[PDB]
Amino acid sequence: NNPEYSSFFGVMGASSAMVFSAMGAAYGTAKSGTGIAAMSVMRPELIMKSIIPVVMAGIIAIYGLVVAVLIANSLTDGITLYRSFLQLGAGLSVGLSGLAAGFAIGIVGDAGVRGTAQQPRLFVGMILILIFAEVLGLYGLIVALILSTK
Amino acid sequence: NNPEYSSFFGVMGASSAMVFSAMGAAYGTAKSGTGIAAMSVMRPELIMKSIIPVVMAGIIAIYGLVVAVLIANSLTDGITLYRSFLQLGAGLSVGLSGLAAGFAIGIVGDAGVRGTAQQPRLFVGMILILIFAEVLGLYGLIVALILSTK
Amino acid sequence: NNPEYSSFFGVMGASSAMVFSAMGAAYGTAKSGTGIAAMSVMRPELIMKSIIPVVMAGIIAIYGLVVAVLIANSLTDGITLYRSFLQLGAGLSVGLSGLAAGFAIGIVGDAGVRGTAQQPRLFVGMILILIFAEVLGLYGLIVALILSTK
Amino acid sequence: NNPEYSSFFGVMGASSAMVFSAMGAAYGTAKSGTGIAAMSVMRPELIMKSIIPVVMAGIIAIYGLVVAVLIANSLTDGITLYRSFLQLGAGLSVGLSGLAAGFAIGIVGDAGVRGTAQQPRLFVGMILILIFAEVLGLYGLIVALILSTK
Amino acid sequence: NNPEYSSFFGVMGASSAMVFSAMGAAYGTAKSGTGIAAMSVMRPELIMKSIIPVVMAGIIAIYGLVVAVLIANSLTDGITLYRSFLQLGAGLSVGLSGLAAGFAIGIVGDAGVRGTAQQPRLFVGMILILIFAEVLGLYGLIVALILSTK
Amino acid sequence: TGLELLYLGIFVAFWACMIVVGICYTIFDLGFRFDVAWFLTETSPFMWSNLGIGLAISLSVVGAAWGIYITGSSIIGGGVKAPRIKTKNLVSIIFCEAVAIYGIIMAIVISNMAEPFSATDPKAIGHRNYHAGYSMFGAGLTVGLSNLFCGVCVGIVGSGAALADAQNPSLFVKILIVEIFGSAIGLFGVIVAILQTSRVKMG
Amino acid sequence: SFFPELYFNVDNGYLEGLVRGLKAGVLSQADYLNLVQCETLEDLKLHLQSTDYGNFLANEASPLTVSVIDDKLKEKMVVEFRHMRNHAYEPLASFLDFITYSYMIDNVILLITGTLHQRSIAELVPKCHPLGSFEQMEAVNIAQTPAELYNAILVDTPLAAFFQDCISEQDLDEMNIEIIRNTLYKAYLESFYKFCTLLGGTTADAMCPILEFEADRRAFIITINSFGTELSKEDRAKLFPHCGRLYPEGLAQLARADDYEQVKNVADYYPEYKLLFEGAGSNPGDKTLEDRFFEHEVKLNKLAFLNQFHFGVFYAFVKLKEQECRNIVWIAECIAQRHRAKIDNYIPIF
Amino acid sequence: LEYSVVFNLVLWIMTGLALAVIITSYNIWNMDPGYDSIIYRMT
Ligand SMILES: CCCCCCCCCCCCCCCCCC(=O)OC[C@H](COP(=O)([O-])OCC[N+](C)(C)C)OC(=O)CCCCCCCCCCCCCCCCC
Ligand SMILES: CCCCCCCCCCCCCCCCCC(=O)OC[C@H](COP(=O)([O-])OCC[N+](C)(C)C)OC(=O)CCCCCCCCCCCCCCCCC
Ligand SMILES: CCCCCCCCCCCCCCCCCC(=O)OC[C@H](COP(=O)([O-])OCC[N+](C)(C)C)OC(=O)CCCCCCCCCCCCCCCCC
Ligand SMILES: CCCCCCCCCCCCCCCCCCCC(=O)O[C@H](COC(=O)CCCCCCCCCCCCCC)COP(=O)(O)OCCN
Ligand SMILES: CCCCCCCCCCCCCCCCCCCC(=O)O[C@H](COC(=O)CCCCCCCCCCCCCC)COP(=O)(O)OCCN
Ligand SMILES: CCCCCCCCCCCCCCCCCCCC(=O)O[C@H](COC(=O)CCCCCCCCCCCCCC)COP(=O)(O)OCCN
Ligand SMILES: CCCCCCCCCCCCCCCCCCCC(=O)O[C@H](COC(=O)CCCCCCCCCCCCCC)COP(=O)(O)OCCN
Ligand SMILES: CC(C)CCC[C@@H](C)[C@H]1CC[C@H]2[C@@H]3CC=C4C[C@@H](O)CC[C@]4(C)[C@H]3CC[C@]12C
Ligand SMILES: CC(C)CCC[C@@H](C)[C@H]1CC[C@H]2[C@@H]3CC=C4C[C@@H](O)CC[C@]4(C)[C@H]3CC[C@]12C
Ligand SMILES: CC(C)CCC[C@@H](C)[C@H]1CC[C@H]2[C@@H]3CC=C4C[C@@H](O)CC[C@]4(C)[C@H]3CC[C@]12C
Ligand SMILES: CC(C)CCC[C@@H](C)[C@H]1CC[C@H]2[C@@H]3CC=C4C[C@@H](O)CC[C@]4(C)[C@H]3CC[C@]12C
Ligand SMILES: CC(C)CCC[C@@H](C)[C@H]1CC[C@H]2[C@@H]3CC=C4C[C@@H](O)CC[C@]4(C)[C@H]3CC[C@]12C
Ligand SMILES: CC(C)CCC[C@@H](C)[C@H]1CC[C@H]2[C@@H]3CC=C4C[C@@H](O)CC[C@]4(C)[C@H]3CC[C@]12C
Ligand SMILES: CC(C)CCC[C@@H](C)[C@H]1CC[C@H]2[C@@H]3CC=C4C[C@@H](O)CC[C@]4(C)[C@H]3CC[C@]12C
Ligand SMILES: CC(C)CCC[C@@H](C)[C@H]1CC[C@H]2[C@@H]3CC=C4C[C@@H](O)CC[C@]4(C)[C@H]3CC[C@]12C
Ligand SMILES: CC(C)CCC[C@@H](C)[C@H]1CC[C@H]2[C@@H]3CC=C4C[C@@H](O)CC[C@]4(C)[C@H]3CC[C@]12C
């Protein structure tokens, strides 16, 4: 059958994979930037190190972009409805997992950057937490890379 | 052949690409303007140097405009429902990615310009963070263009 | 022949181009007038120079008006549904881009007039930000024209 | 050969033109009202001079009334769906443009009458800003007429 | 013959004319009364004069009633859909214009009554503003009549 | 504002859904499925009439209770130091209760217009029955909401008058006028309701 | 508008009526004249018994003293406020708590002053204002340790939020007690203004003007009193509350101010303060600036009663009764010291 | 032929379930942190 609207869900999947990942990364970057601004006044030498959270947030966006492009490359005029649903699911997975990971990274980075201004030893700990948070996004990506290619 | 309502999603894609990107850039500009107004009272000679976040928000708006014009030049009466969905997805992707990037740019720029009033070394850091937010919108544009040219 | 509901979307495009642009200009003018009233108590001589925000807000309304009139001149009994979609998209684009630009102009102008009461050197900077907060509306107008004259 | 429900939209034009404008005007006449009262305790001699905002708000209402009456005189039993949509668009345009202009006039007039009690020179400035706000409503009327007299 | 459901919109027109005008008049009377009662302890000799706003608010109700009566007298079980829509529009116009005028009268009357308690010279000014608000309701009535008689 | 947030979310979601649904129906040439005639016609007139009566009574009682508590809190707060209030200001309460009375009366005046059909086909139900149902619903709405607003307004004015009375005895007699004005609205609603169901006849 | 009419009386209508009834008992001008015509404090009590005060002073010893009258007036006000608070719900309860923070800020200053000078904290409670009583036991039996007292304030006192303006307990021994008090009051006033603005509606409308005048008068008098002291302009500007109508460029100009003439010039931009400064001749025999500010404060509190559905009535009543108690104490002082000439310096209310 | 019934059943059941989940998650997310005895010690 291949209904004429079959590609709608795949396109929405690409749009989600990019939009929600971008939202998560934007929140992460905003919170980390606020923390870095509030930290650098007293501890200027820590500006470059304490930029690690932003990078992590950026990585989340990358994830989304990948999936989005992948979904964008898997589209086609006669895309079967099953594949369109698969791609919508992959897009929602990656996008919302990236949104959650970006929120977590933003909060963790703000807190850890502010704390490291007062307790240098916290730095490594923050990194660990950040990694865990970022892994969440990776999980979404993995699921997306299982769905968009299923 | 093609349904008479196909062009609806294309026009909505163009309108979203413009409107949401403009909303993001407007938020970025507003937050950066408030930050600069607060900063300039004590440290006036930083006003010109501190106009960067507004420029980055403008660049996000330009991303949105580019995608909107691309969709508005590839929009024809006999636009296939599939291509109409492609253009709607491109528009939503660029518009909401630019919205998120504008939010991040506004918050980061406000914090960075306020801090640089007190810590000059923060300036460079702010720029870095802003770039990490800017790429978000860029990512959206990338995806949008793909979907627009698919 | 053509659907009778196409004129509804055409008139919605016209009325949106007018209404949303007027709302943006009204918000800009209200915020700028509040800022001017607050500023002029101590610095009367800047009552006139601080009116530039309002003008830059009024321009946004003009943009909308332009598009609105264009649509109100392109309307006819037998506009193809695709033409009605084009007009609706142009109207939404101009109206909502002008709304965002008006929000940005109001916030930036209020902050700039309040700051300029304490720091004259901010004025020029303020102007630049307003321009960056005004081109957004211009962008919308452009897209609207590209959609309206297609 | 036209739907018997075609006039509905046209009516909802007239109604809207007189309703929303009125609401806008009311807000103006409300906010300015309060302002005058608040500033009348200390500076009684400015009560009559500081009645300009209300007058401007009143004019906004008239705009709506005009369009409403115009629409109410253009209605017919066999009104085509196209003309009905035109009248609905004109009514919404004038009503919501007047609503935005009334909000702006109320805020600006309250601020200006409160400030002029403290800064006489602000009076002229206020007037200018009010004119700009008034112009917004005027724009709507223009568009409404263009839509309501096709 | 005409539709079975045609009288619904006329019925709703009468109901709106009365309900929303009653809402406006009730709010105006409540606000004015709670201002007048609180003033009276300080300035007991003003109550009678300060009753003027209440009367104005009451007039709004009358307008609704008038139009309601019209719609309740010209409404038969077999009125054309066109006349039913006209009565619905007249009812909505009068009701919502009266609502806005009642809100404006309540706000202005309360503020002006308190100011007169503090500044007798404001009395006349208040009256003017009240008239400017009261006229709004009148405008609605006009339009309502034009729609209900047509 | 958690509950306010929930209400705002429900409202925004419902109306965004309505906008998108209307756009889809209009654009996909499926407008014929959006039969408002079918909704207004298949829906039984009994629903409209009974909702009208129920609202006529319930909204009037809601306004009466709103005003009664609004003014009774003030009466019983002021009377702690000036108990005379309890004697004089009951008039305010009376006015509020008067609202409710109108309610029941109109309910009766509406409930007397009901009658079964023994028909289900809209052609069989007919213009007379459909208009009877719609007009009973509209009269119920008018009386109920006018009485609600009148009761709330009279309660607010009565609370103000009771607070004023606690400090100067010679003010209530001059503030009651406002209440009288606030009461008129109630009557107006009743009148309109009586005009809406004047020529209503189910059967 | 916020429509406080519809739901205010649900929780606070009874207390609105009760506080207005209490305000009806504040001495009028005629009662003030009657008390002014007294010859002896016993005659003052006699003439005061006919007012709302009644027999509040009959129990006390026949040889009355101004201290006894002041204590009884303060006790009556405290009892009335506590009764109102006990019957108040969450929002109005928070409002009344904010009212009491004003006296808690002075009480905590007393506590730290005593602790630093090594006097038992339990022996300082009698001198604390009742409305700001530290019923919490965490700040008692401190063993005269300033660090323990600071931790107690942070843990078991609503002032913990305002003590974040400071940076550490060392500040207790670093900054002068007056600077600490003024910083705490600035933070408290800003928090109160934010709370009132969040409440919105008639509460914000009728309460923001009072807090704005409080901030402006705080700025003016901190500028005027600090001219001859070591309090630097940079440290002085930190004590100006940001709620006032002077915030844009007004507080800055005051901070740059270096003389009373410059303060008058700054006030000139605001007619409402221009009149107060003009009337404050400040030479012997006429109203001083503080008296003019007291008159304006009383005027604002009185105008707070023209609104109905708002919490500002409680703050207005508390301040008006505070001024009434001060007026009665002033009249008693003039009677006792036989200085009839200045007996008219009391600020009338209603 | 029963499209109306199943559509309404599913729509309203799932809307109610989603509202319940949202309300519960808001009541837990916006739960009082519980360490108010520690907020003033850490800050
Ligand atoms: C969040 C708070 C809790 C929820 C409270 C609010 C609840 C709102 C109630 C929803 C009921 C809406 C009516 C459903 C029936 C109409 C559907 C329709 O127009 O399509 C069918 C109509 C008519 O369909 P048809 O008539 O061709 O189908 C044949 C007939 N049936 C199916 C019955 C056999 O048009 C279509 O066919 C459109 C197909 C695409 C579907 C588009 C649906 C519109 C909405 C989609 C996005 C969701 C909107 C919200 C956005 C996110 C939130 C803000
Ligand atoms: C930013 C928000 C994201 C955008 C998407 C929002 C959610 C909307 C999706 C809801 C789920 C519905 C998916 C389609 C389900 C299948 C429907 C079907 O069979 O279609 C038959 C319908 C109706 O039948 P028909 O027209 O195909 O059959 C012919 C009928 N005659 C002969 C009468 C013409 O048509 C389609 O084929 C529709 C296919 C595409 C539908 C896409 C969803 C519609 C809503 C899109 C969003 C609208 C706003 C756009 C702008 C937003 C910008 C912010
Ligand atoms: C939020 C506040 C309320 C306003 C927004 C929501 C309004 C509507 C909400 C109720 C549910 C949807 C109602 C419409 C149902 C569709 C009726 C239908 O198909 O018949 C159409 C009818 C008839 O359709 P038809 O297919 O019979 O065509 C006529 C064909 N002949 C003559 C041969 C019979 O015509 C119209 O198009 C009337 C216009 C109304 C339909 C469109 C609804 C607009 C929804 C809001 C979005 C507006 C777009 C622009 C956005 C910017 C706005 C400034
Ligand atoms: C900010 C956003 C920016 C990014 C862009 C937007 C991306 C997110 C939005 C995605 C929208 C697409 C959702 C797809 C819903 C429809 C799926 C097809 C349904 C379908 O055909 O089957 C019907 C079942 O309906 C059903 O019951 C299906 C309804 C499913 C309801 C659940 C809601 C969707 C879940 C995903 C949304 C998540 C959003 C998160 C923010 C059968 O019905 P029939 O028998 O009549 O079929 C007759 C057809 N021939
Ligand atoms: C905004 C983002 C987009 C949202 C879109 C989805 C739709 C909206 C869903 C809610 C989204 C926002 C989160 C709100 C959660 C619920 C409200 C707050 C929490 C809550 O319910 O708890 C208390 C009520 O108790 C309760 O638990 C009682 C509530 C349950 C009652 C159910 C009955 C209503 C059914 C709906 C029909 C009525 C329609 C009326 C328009 C209110 O907390 P508080 O404010 O006292 O404390 C302050 C903090 N909670
Ligand atoms: C910018 C914002 C949007 C503004 C635009 C207006 C939006 C209004 C929302 C309502 C929906 C739009 C109105 C037009 C569509 C009406 C439905 C047309 C579909 C149709 O063909 O149905 C006819 C019956 O409907 C009819 O003839 C029904 C006539 C009445 C339609 C209007 C009623 C809407 C509800 C108003 C409530 C007001 C409440 C006030 C308190 C067929 O019938 P047939 O005779 O061919 O049957 C043949 C059976 N064999
Ligand atoms: C974070 C990402 C994850 C997303 C969150 C979770 C969302 C997942 C989706 C959950 C919501 C919907 C779940 C399924 C709904 C459909 C259930 C019935 C299945 C169905 O299609 O039944 C047909 C009949 O349906 C019918 O006749 C009527 C079907 C129409 C149902 C429409 C339901 C409206 C949408 C409900 C959810 C809205 C809000 C959800 C939050 C087949 O039966 P047949 O015998 O006809 O077989 C075909 C031969 N004719
Ligand atoms: C890390 C930065 C530079 C972001 C870009 C990530 C790169 C590695 C990703 C993003 C999207 C990816 C593409 C997604 C889809 C496909 C389809 C397949 O048929 C060939 C590989 C190809 C073309 C991928 C190549 C690698 C790719 C370009
Ligand atoms: C590289 C670091 C971050 C570790 C992450 C693990 C990566 C390498 C793993 C985890 C899940 C994997 C994907 C799982 C499923 C599929 C679909 C299959 O048809 C081909 C490969 C593909 C697309 C895999 C590619 C590699 C992958 C993404
Ligand atoms: C500063 C702002 C205005 C930047 C504007 C964005 C520019 C770079 C973009 C927006 C849309 C683009 C145009 C889109 C379509 C066409 C037609 C095509 O056949 C060749 C290039 C051309 C002509 C593009 C040139 C570059 C372009 C004008
Ligand atoms: C400012 C820049 C970096 C943003 C855009 C990224 C560039 C590199 C990307 C975005 C979309 C891409 C296009 C998407 C699709 C096609 C169609 C294909 O048949 C040839 C390549 C071509 C034409 C791509 C060329 C590269 C492209 C233009
Ligand atoms: C306030 C003023 C100075 C700003 C500009 C507004 C005026 C001049 C604008 C607004 C609407 C515009 C019109 C929009 C549409 C049309 C139809 C088009 O086919 C030719 C020009 C014409 C007729 C335009 C002429 C200029 C116009 C009238
Ligand atoms: C130059 C900068 C400042 C932009 C200001 C002018 C903008 C708003 C307007 C003025 C005239 C307009 C052009 C007029 C006509 C056409 C031809 C049409 O088929 C597509 C759009 C296009 C190409 C328009 C694009 C937008 C446009 C260039
Ligand atoms: C002073 C009184 C009349 C009310 C104030 C508003 C007046 C000026 C408005 C209200 C309605 C208006 C009328 C509305 C419609 C038309 C039809 C048009 O083809 C000629 C102008 C004419 C006849 C307008 C003239 C001006 C008008 C009478
Ligand atoms: C500054 C002045 C001119 C503006 C104030 C009056 C406005 C409302 C009037 C003056 C002249 C009017 C125009 C004169 C003639 C027509 C032709 C008609 O087919 C559509 C409306 C249109 C295009 C009018 C629009 C409204 C209009 C611009
Ligand atoms: C009566 C007092 C309050 C003065 C206010 C004027 C209002 C209420 C009345 C008095 C005369 C009325 C007009 C008399 C005649 C007609 C002609 C009819 O086809 C439409 C209504 C219309 C145009 C009326 C509109 C409303 C009107 C202007």
Short mmCIF file of C-alpha atoms in Angstrom, two decimals, chain E residues 41-142:
data_model
loop_
_atom_site.label_atom_id
_atom_site.label_comp_id
_atom_site.label_asym_id
_atom_site.label_seq_id
_atom_site.Cartn_x
_atom_site.Cartn_y
_atom_site.Cartn_z
CA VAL E 41 -15.05 56.02 56.63
CA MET E 42 -12.62 58.81 55.73
CA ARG E 43 -14.92 61.05 53.64
CA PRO E 44 -18.50 60.20 54.63
CA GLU E 45 -19.98 63.17 52.74
CA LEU E 46 -18.84 61.93 49.31
CA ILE E 47 -20.75 58.63 49.10
CA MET E 48 -23.66 60.06 47.12
CA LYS E 49 -21.40 61.68 44.52
CA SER E 50 -19.24 58.55 44.48
CA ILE E 51 -22.37 56.55 43.60
CA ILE E 52 -22.08 57.91 40.05
CA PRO E 53 -19.68 55.17 38.84
CA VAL E 54 -22.03 52.47 40.15
CA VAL E 55 -24.89 53.97 38.14
CA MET E 56 -22.68 53.94 35.06
CA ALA E 57 -21.87 50.28 35.63
CA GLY E 58 -25.57 49.60 36.04
CA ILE E 59 -26.25 51.21 32.67
CA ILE E 60 -24.09 48.54 31.05
CA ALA E 61 -26.47 45.86 32.32
CA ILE E 62 -29.37 47.81 30.83
CA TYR E 63 -27.72 47.75 27.42
CA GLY E 64 -27.44 43.98 27.59
CA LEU E 65 -31.03 43.71 28.73
CA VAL E 66 -32.19 45.91 25.85
CA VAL E 67 -30.43 43.84 23.21
CA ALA E 68 -31.39 40.63 24.99
CA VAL E 69 -35.03 41.67 24.87
CA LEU E 70 -34.75 42.34 21.15
CA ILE E 71 -33.21 38.93 20.51
CA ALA E 72 -35.79 37.31 22.78
CA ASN E 73 -38.65 38.97 20.85
CA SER E 74 -37.42 38.50 17.27
CA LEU E 75 -36.45 34.85 17.85
CA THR E 76 -38.96 32.27 16.63
CA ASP E 77 -38.47 28.53 16.22
CA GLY E 78 -38.21 28.92 12.44
CA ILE E 79 -35.83 31.83 11.88
CA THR E 80 -33.40 31.57 9.00
CA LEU E 81 -29.83 30.63 9.85
CA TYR E 82 -28.82 34.12 8.69
CA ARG E 83 -31.01 35.92 11.22
CA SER E 84 -29.92 33.50 13.94
CA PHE E 85 -26.27 34.28 13.23
CA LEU E 86 -27.07 38.00 13.20
CA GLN E 87 -28.67 37.70 16.63
CA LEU E 88 -25.72 35.66 17.93
CA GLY E 89 -23.33 38.34 16.69
CA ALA E 90 -25.39 41.16 18.19
CA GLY E 91 -25.55 39.33 21.50
CA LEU E 92 -21.83 38.60 21.61
CA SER E 93 -21.01 42.18 20.61
CA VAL E 94 -23.20 43.81 23.25
CA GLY E 95 -22.26 41.30 25.93
CA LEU E 96 -18.50 41.48 25.52
CA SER E 97 -18.44 45.24 24.91
CA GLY E 98 -20.44 45.61 28.12
CA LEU E 99 -18.02 43.27 29.88
CA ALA E 100 -15.03 45.38 28.83
CA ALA E 101 -16.85 48.61 29.70
CA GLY E 102 -17.81 47.19 33.09
CA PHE E 103 -14.23 46.22 33.86
CA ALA E 104 -13.04 49.68 32.82
CA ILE E 105 -15.77 51.38 34.84
CA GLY E 106 -14.97 49.31 37.92
CA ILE E 107 -11.26 50.09 37.74
CA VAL E 108 -11.69 53.78 36.93
CA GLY E 109 -14.49 54.30 39.45
CA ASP E 110 -12.61 52.65 42.30
CA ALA E 111 -9.42 54.59 41.57
CA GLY E 112 -11.19 57.91 41.04
CA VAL E 113 -13.37 57.50 44.12
CA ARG E 114 -10.30 56.92 46.28
CA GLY E 115 -8.53 59.85 44.63
CA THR E 116 -11.53 62.11 45.25
CA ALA E 117 -11.41 60.95 48.86
CA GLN E 118 -7.84 62.27 48.69
CA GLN E 119 -8.33 65.04 46.08
CA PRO E 120 -11.79 66.56 45.49
CA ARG E 121 -10.69 68.26 42.26
CA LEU E 122 -10.33 64.82 40.66
CA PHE E 123 -14.10 64.26 40.76
CA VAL E 124 -14.87 65.89 37.41
CA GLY E 125 -11.87 64.19 35.84
CA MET E 126 -13.09 60.81 37.04
CA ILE E 127 -16.49 61.46 35.49
CA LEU E 128 -14.90 62.20 32.13
CA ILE E 129 -12.90 58.98 32.21
CA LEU E 130 -15.96 57.03 33.33
CA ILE E 131 -17.91 58.43 30.38
CA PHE E 132 -15.09 57.39 28.06
CA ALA E 133 -15.40 53.88 29.48
CA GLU E 134 -19.20 53.97 29.53
CA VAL E 135 -19.31 54.98 25.87
CA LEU E 136 -17.57 51.69 25.07
CA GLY E 137 -20.63 49.76 26.21
CA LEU E 138 -22.80 52.13 24.21
CA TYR E 139 -20.74 51.36 21.12
CA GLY E 140 -21.48 47.67 21.54
CA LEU E 141 -25.18 48.39 21.89
CA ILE E 142 -25.13 50.34 18.63
#
